[PDB]
From a paper:
The membrane-bound rotor consists of a ring of eight identical c-subunits in close association with a single static a (or ATP-6) subunit, attached to the asymmetrical central stalk (subunits γ, δ, and ε) which extends from the membrane domain and penetrates into the extrinsic globular catalytic domain along its central axis. Focused local refinement of the rotor (c8-ring plus subunits γ, δ, and ε), the stator (subunits OSCP, b, d, and F6 and associated supernumerary subunits e, f, and g) and the membrane domain (subunits a, A6L, b, d, e, f, g, j, k, and the c8-ring) improved the quality of the maps and the resolutions in these regions to 3.5 to 3.7, 4.2 to 6.0, and 3.6 Å. As it rotates, the asymmetrical central stalk brings about structural changes in the three catalytic sites, found mainly in each of the three β-subunits, which alternate with three noncatalytic α-subunits in the spherical extrinsic domain. The inhibition of ATP hydrolysis in the isolated catalytic F1-domain arrests the rotary cycle at the catalytic dwell, and in structures of the inhibited bovine F1-IF1 complex, the rotary cycle has been arrested at 27° to 32° after the pause in the rotary cycle preceding the release of phosphate. In the current structure, the postphosphate release angles are 28.8°, 26.2°, and 25.5° in states 1 to 3, respectively. Therefore, the rotational angle in the F1-domain is not influenced significantly by interactions with the additional components of the intact enzyme that are absent from the isolated F1-domain. The central cavity of the c8-ring contains a poorly defined, noisy density observed also in the porcine and yeast c-rings (S13 A–E). Here, the upper half of this density has been attributed to a mobile lipid (including possibly coenzyme Q10), and the lower half has been ascribed to another mobile lipid and the C-terminal region of the e-subunit, which extends toward the central cavity on the inter-membrane space (IMS) side of the membrane and could just penetrate into the cavity.
Residue numbers in the entry:
A (entry chain G): 1 to 272
B (entry chain H): 15 to 146
C (entry chain I): 1 to 47
D (entry chain L), G (entry chain K), J (entry chain P): 1 to 74
E (entry chain M), F (entry chain N), H (entry chain O), I (entry chain R), K (entry chain Q): 1 to 75
Write the structure that this text describes.
Amino acid sequence: ATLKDITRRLKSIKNIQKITKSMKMVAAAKYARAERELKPARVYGVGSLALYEKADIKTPEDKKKHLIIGVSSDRGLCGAIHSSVAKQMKSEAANLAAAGKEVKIIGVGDKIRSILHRTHSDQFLVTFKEVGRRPPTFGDASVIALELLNSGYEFDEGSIIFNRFRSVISYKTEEKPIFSLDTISSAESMSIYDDIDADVLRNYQEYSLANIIYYSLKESTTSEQSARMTAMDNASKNASEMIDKLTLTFNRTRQAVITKELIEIISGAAAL
Amino acid sequence: QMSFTFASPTQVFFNSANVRQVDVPTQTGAFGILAAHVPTLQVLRPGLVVVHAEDGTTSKYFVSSGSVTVNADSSVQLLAEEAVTLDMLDLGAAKANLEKAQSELLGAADEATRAEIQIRIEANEALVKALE
Amino acid sequence: VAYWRQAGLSYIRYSQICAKAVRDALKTEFKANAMKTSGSTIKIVKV
Amino acid sequence: DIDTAAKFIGAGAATVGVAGSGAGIGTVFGSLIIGYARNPSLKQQLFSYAILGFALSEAMGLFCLMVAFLILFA
Amino acid sequence: DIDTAAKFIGAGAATVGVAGSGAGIGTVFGSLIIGYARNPSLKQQLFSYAILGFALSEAMGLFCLMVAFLILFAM
Amino acid sequence: DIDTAAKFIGAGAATVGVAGSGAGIGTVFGSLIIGYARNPSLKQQLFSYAILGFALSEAMGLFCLMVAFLILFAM
Amino acid sequence: DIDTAAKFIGAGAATVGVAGSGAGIGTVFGSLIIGYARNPSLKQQLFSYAILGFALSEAMGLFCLMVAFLILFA
Amino acid sequence: DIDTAAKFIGAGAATVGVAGSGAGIGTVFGSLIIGYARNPSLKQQLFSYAILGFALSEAMGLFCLMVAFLILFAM
Amino acid sequence: DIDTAAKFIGAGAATVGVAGSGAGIGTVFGSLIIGYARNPSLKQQLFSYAILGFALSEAMGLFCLMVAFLILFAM
Amino acid sequence: DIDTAAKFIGAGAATVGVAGSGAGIGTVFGSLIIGYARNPSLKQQLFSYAILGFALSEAMGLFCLMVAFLILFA
Amino acid sequence: DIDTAAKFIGAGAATVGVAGSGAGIGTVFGSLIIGYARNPSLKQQLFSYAILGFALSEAMGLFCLMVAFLILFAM
């Protein structure tokens, strides 16, 4: 079409291709770091969850108050992960509210708050930002657990909802339980455990909350980085093929312009 | 037999390996765990855990705090926020920081601040005894 | 019940304090790479 | 009679064997309380063992008392 | 007289056995205190077991007192 | 008078029953110490239980003491 | 003969040794209750050791009783 | 003499009541050691409780000794 | 003779000292039960210590019994 | 006279008060073992408390022996 | 021969005091079993404390036996 418009389009799409290539490179480096960092964090999280796996704890149905935690970031160029965790959060919140249980939300990341602001924002206790700027570390888990316990909400049962990382391209939105001490001490399945006071359990639960939060942060960061990698790779390939088509169109337009200009010049020379 | 897992957030020392005896320091009191210990759920206090390997060999690690779980089926998970090999610490630094911490110990602003500083002294004292 | 439970602390603060007091006693070469991945970069926004 | 006297003091001496069984019963019920405060779910087996202990230490206390009554009337 | 001497000596020897009951109540109440300090919510049941043990040690304490009084006063 | 002799011997062999009260009160206060150590936040109730156990064991010892004094003074 | 008086006093004196058996049985079964409550999964070895302590305490208890009767039956 | 001889026998028998106080003192201080080992942060109050425990075991197991001297010296 | 009577008296009094082996064996095997309850992997060494303690209380049980038999016959 | 006979009896009775002190010493050192095993870093203070408890429960039986020797030779 | 009978009865009543050492040795070895079950790696130190408790209650056992043989033989 118009030569200058097509030129600007070609230049802009070239910019898009190379900027998304740069983003893919930085995301590949970040994911390479994150996988090695996650490798022992898996062992740590599994070791934490071992107790609640070995002991078949359940839910004292009469208890109402409930927590839902969603772990994501504040950056949103990777797409589907925030939507998936948000969808799981909406499903659980709706179901448990339909079960007549006071449901509260803590969203780790700006994207959870953004995608649940219009509808469920009244139920949030605290949201945290500046996650994903730096690789997550156990101090972030500590501060999140502190802001949870210090808050004036003594929940009865919670659920952390994150993306477990499977492969460079595979992530699954999983959800793991979080138990209050009232559930733990009022379960007759765990009575076998010896030398546990009513105060040892406070410490153990306050620590395992941070443990599960840290595990979720590690898994979510790894899965997010891999998702951003693959999304940028797909965008780069689409931009490359679109540039390939636009180059052919540009060549055709330039040949047409040359032909028309020579035709007009020869006609004007023939006129005089 | 035992299936032991010693883990810090940034490091794994035993990944479901097997050992003969693990002497852990806990808040209520240090104790040793063997092949069929009774299930316990202790939390940790700054100390050193010694791990007896399958042979007569032994190893030591300083754990700042954390949690020890002894499952019914002899599975043991010892998680520590900062567990460092015993050769990664300075006696001079530990002594200096303990002395300083006690130097503002008497300046107890509020009970919470006194508790915070005094936990600093407790960790430093346990570390120094680990190295003295 | 330990003296930090009366004062109004949690086991998270106890763990943080003990971990930091271990931090300061590392061999100065090891403190360099133990400082990285030991911060708290989360920012809280209220309601 | 000297022998009636000896019977009386001998029965008195046989009576002091009840103290040990009393202490044993106190200990067994104390440990029953401890165990219940530790594992309330069981309870029934703790009480079965505690009644076994109570009856069985009372057995020895009554053995002492039967010796006393044999001294008195034999 | 010898009868009035033997009765005194026998009563003195017989009233000892309630030392066992004293020790039993001491152990019972100490265990009550410990078990209530461990898991206080079971207070009423712990107290029921405590009074059971106390009465059941007083049983033999009173048995020793009754044999002492039977020898000393009536026979 | 052999009766006076037997009164002395009976009182001597009767006052020994306070040994049980001594052991029981020792046990009560020791278990008070242990229980209060485990959790110091209900020292009040632990002390009340300790007082009650003390009173019971002391009174059981006082029974032996009063039997001794009753044989010594009265007959 | 005063030998009957000696036999009666000796029989009354020996049988207080059953106080040790009473205290020992109370302690053994109390510790059995506590150990079973602390760990129910071994209530066959806790019980074997409890009956073994039974045997080893009743051995000396019946030694005291048999010495008492031998004194009565010398 | 006979009655004085029985006074001596009665004093010897009466002094046995010190055994209970000895056992109680042992129990109290053993429990202090255990409790302190569990909680060193209460040393002061634990020792101040054991002082009362020892005092009330001693002052009550010494009545037997006092009455032993009462029999021996001044009837 | 009165010495033959005192032989039986002293034997019956000396056999009283087996109650200490009583408390001893009871405590040893009860504590073995508790120790094996907590740490079953140590059963061999726990039982070895238990046999050592049982033998060490039985040693004094036989001390008392041999003294009794000495007073009875071998004097 | 009969007086020396009763002095013998009184000494032989008063010397048994030492049994309570022996049991108390056993209790103090046993709880010292348990307390040291629970918290190995308090060694010195635990040993000091054990020695204090020994001194007291020792003096209690030592005065039993003192009264026994007083009766025996006075 | 009244002294001959008194010697026998006094030695018989004197040998009872070994009961305290029996109970004490039982207690120390039971506590050794428990504390070795809890913290096995302190085996050596626990054993060096058990030997001390053993010997230092055998002290009082030997005091009672020495008094008993003193009465029996050496006036």
